[PDB]
Amino acid sequence: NLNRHIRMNFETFRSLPTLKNSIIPLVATSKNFGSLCTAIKSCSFLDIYNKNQLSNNLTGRLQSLSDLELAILISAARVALRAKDGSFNFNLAYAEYEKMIKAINSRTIKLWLKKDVKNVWENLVQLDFFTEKSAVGLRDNATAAFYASNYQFQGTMIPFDLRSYQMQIILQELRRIIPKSNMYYSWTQL
Amino acid sequence: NVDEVSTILVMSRCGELMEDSCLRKRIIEEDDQFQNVAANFIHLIVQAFHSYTGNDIFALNDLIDFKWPKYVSRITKENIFEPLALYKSA
Amino acid sequence: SDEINELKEMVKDEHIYDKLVRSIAPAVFGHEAVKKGILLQMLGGVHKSTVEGIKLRGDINICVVGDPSTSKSQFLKYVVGFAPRSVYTSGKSAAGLTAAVVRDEEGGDYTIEAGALMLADNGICCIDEFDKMDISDQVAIHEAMEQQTISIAKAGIHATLNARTSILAAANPVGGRYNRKLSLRGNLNMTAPIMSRFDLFFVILDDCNEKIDTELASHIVDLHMKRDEAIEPPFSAEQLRRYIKYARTFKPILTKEARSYLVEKYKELRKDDAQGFSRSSYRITVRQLESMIRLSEAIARANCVDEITPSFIAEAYDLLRQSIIRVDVTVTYDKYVSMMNMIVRKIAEVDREGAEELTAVDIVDWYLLQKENDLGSLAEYWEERRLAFKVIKRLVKDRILMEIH
Secondary structure (H helix, E strand, C coil), rough: HHHHHHHHHHCCCCCHHHHHHHHHHHHHCCHHHHHEEEHHHHHHHHHHHHHHHHCCCCCHHHHCHHHHHHHHHHHHHHHHHCCCCEEHHHHHHHHHHHHHHHHHHCCCCCCCCCCCCHHHHHHHHHCCEEEEECCCCCCCHHHHHEEEECCCCCHHCCHHHHHHEEEEEHHHHHHHCCCCHHHHHHHCCC | CCCHHHHHHHHHHHHHHCCCCHHHCCCCCHHHHHHHHHHHHHHHHHCCCCHCCCHHHHHHHHHHHHHHHHHHCCCCCCCCCCCCHHHHHC | HHHHHHHHHHCCCHHHHHHHHHCCCCCCCHHHHHHHHHHHHCCCCCCCCCCCCCCCCCCCCCEEEEECCCHHHHHHHHHCEEEEEEEEEEECHHHHEEEEECCCCCCCCCEEECCCHHHHHEEEEEECCCCCCCCCHHHHHCCCCCEEEEEEEEEEEEEEEEEECCCEEEECCCCCCCCCCCCCCHHHHCCCCHCCCCCEEEEECCCCCCCHHHHHHHHHHHHHCCCEEEEEEEHHHHHHHHHHHHHHCCCCCEEEEHHHHHHHHHHHHHHHHCCCCCCCCCCCHHHHHHHHHHHHHHHHHHHCCCCECHHHHHHHHHHHHHCCCCCCEEEEHHHHHHHHHHHHHHHHHHHHHHCCCCCCCHHHHHHHHHHHCCCCCCCCHHHHHHHHHHHHHHHHHHHCCCCCC
C-alpha cells in the first residue's frame, strides 16, 4: 500500500513536501508501536486524508445541500445553458423553478414563495456557486485593491433580482455528480 | 448534514431554553419533562426550515428565538404530555 | 348470452381504467400518458343539441407532437386497424380530405365525391405529417373542426355535408428535435386557429436515459422472437371492440356537486398563466374549459357510470396539465404517486374528525384493508409490506410527512 500511494502521487503531484503532509499526521496519531505498523501497512489513514482535501470543493459542497438548494442551482443552470452569453438573474431562476414544481406534482412538494428564496439565493453566493458577470474579484497587488474599493460598482445599486450572475458549474457536470436515486435527475438533461 | 446539525443544536440550546423566564412562568399560570419539550421544538424547527436555511447554524438559531415565546404561550395543561395536539395548535 | 356475462365482470372491476390503457397498442412500450387519450378518443363525448339548432362538438382531437422515430407510425396504424370506419391519410390534398366535385363521365352532371373526412364518419381519422401541409389544404380542415360540417358551393351545388370525425394529427417540430426554449406555436408549422382545436398535446421528448433505453430495447427483442407469444394483454381484441361500442351509448349527466369542482379547477389552472412566472406554451382560452367537460364524459363512459363523479374531474385535470408543458426559460413511479395520494388524505382526515394520532404501525395497517385485490398470496404479500416501509421512509427525509417520536 505504500508503493501505491507513492506511484499515485508521482503521476498527479510529483512533489515531496506535498506527500509529506500526510505522513506526519499518520505517525503522530499512532498510540503505540502496534498501531504504527498497522497504519503503515494498510494505509487506512491515507485514504481519509485524501477525502478531506476534496471535501470543500465543487463536488463536496453539492452533497451538503438540501432539496431546495439543489432545485435552485439546477433551474438556474438551464437558463444560462439555453442563453447565448449565460446571463441570468433571480427573476430568470425563479421562473424555471416554479415551472418544475407544477410539472412534477401534476404527474406534495411545498412551493416556496418568492420571499423565501431570497435567503437561499444569498446562501449559494457565499458558497461559491454564483459569480457576478464581468467581475474581477480578488486583485493581484494592493494597488488595484484600493482603487476598486473607492469605485461603486453597478451591481450594488441595482436590486438583487436584476443582478447578472454566472454559473460556476455547467449542467453537463451536474449530471455526473448526482445519483439516479434523486428526484431532480430528470431535469438535468435538457 | 441533516443528522449532525440537529444534534449540535440540541446539545447547545437545551441548557438555555428550559431555564428561560417564559417557560417557568407558563407552568405556574396554567426536570426530565422540560428536556423532552425543548428537544421536540428544536427538532420541529430544523425539519420545517431545512430547505429555507440549508445547513447554516446562524440561520437556524435566529428562527428558534423568534418562535420560542410564541411556542411556550401555546402550551396548556393538556399539551404538556400530548405532542400531537401541540403541533396542531401552533 | 356469454358476451353479456363477460361485460358484467369488467364493470365490477375497480381497476378497469388501468387495464384498458396497457391493452391499447401493446407493441409500444411506455408512454402511458399518450395511451390514456386513445381510450377517451375512441369513446368520445355526448353530442348535445341546443334549443336553437346548433350542434355541440363532442369529439376530442389529439395531436401527436414529438421527436421523429418515436413509434409515431405504430399509434396511427393501430387506430385504423381496429376502429371501424377509419381512413388513413397523410399530409403530403385539399380534395382528398373533405370532398371534391368531379363530373360523371356517364351521366354528364356534376357529382360529389367523398374524401377522407366523409367515408370515416363517426370514427377516428388518422392524419400523418400535419406540419408539411399547404395553406389551402389546411383551410378546409379547420372548417370541419367547429360545426362538424363541410360547406360546398361549386358548379351550382350548394349543399352542406356533415363531418363528425376525430382528427388524429401527428406533425413534426421545425428543426428536428423539440426545443424546450421555444413555445409550441414557434416550434410547429401550424396556424393559430388550427392549433387551438386540439384538446390535448402529448409532447414526447426523446430523452437519452439508461433506464428507459434498457427496458425499451428488451421489449423489441422479445417481440421479434416470440412474435405473438410475447403479447399477453389483459383483454383480447374481440373483448375490447364490444366494450367500446357498448360504452358509447351511455350519456353521463353532470351532478350538482361535480359542477362546483369543475369551476374551481378551472380558476386554479388559469391563475398559472396570468402570474407571468411559468411561461406556458399556449394561452388558456375558452376552449380549455369545454375540453374538460368532454374529457370527463369519456372517463365516466369507460366505467359505465351515468353520473359524472367529482373524482373523474381530477383525473382529466392531471392529463390536461401534463400536455401543457411550460417553456424552459427500485420503486415504480406509478406506485409512488398512488401511495402518496392515499397517505395525505388519511392524515388530513384526522384533523377534521378529531382523533388521537397515527403511529408507524397504523400506517401499514391502513393499506391492509384497502388493498384487498393485490393478489399477494404469501410470497408477494411480504414484499408489499417491506415496500410500504421504504415508501414511508422517503416521506420522512422529504418535506411531506414527519415523525414526532
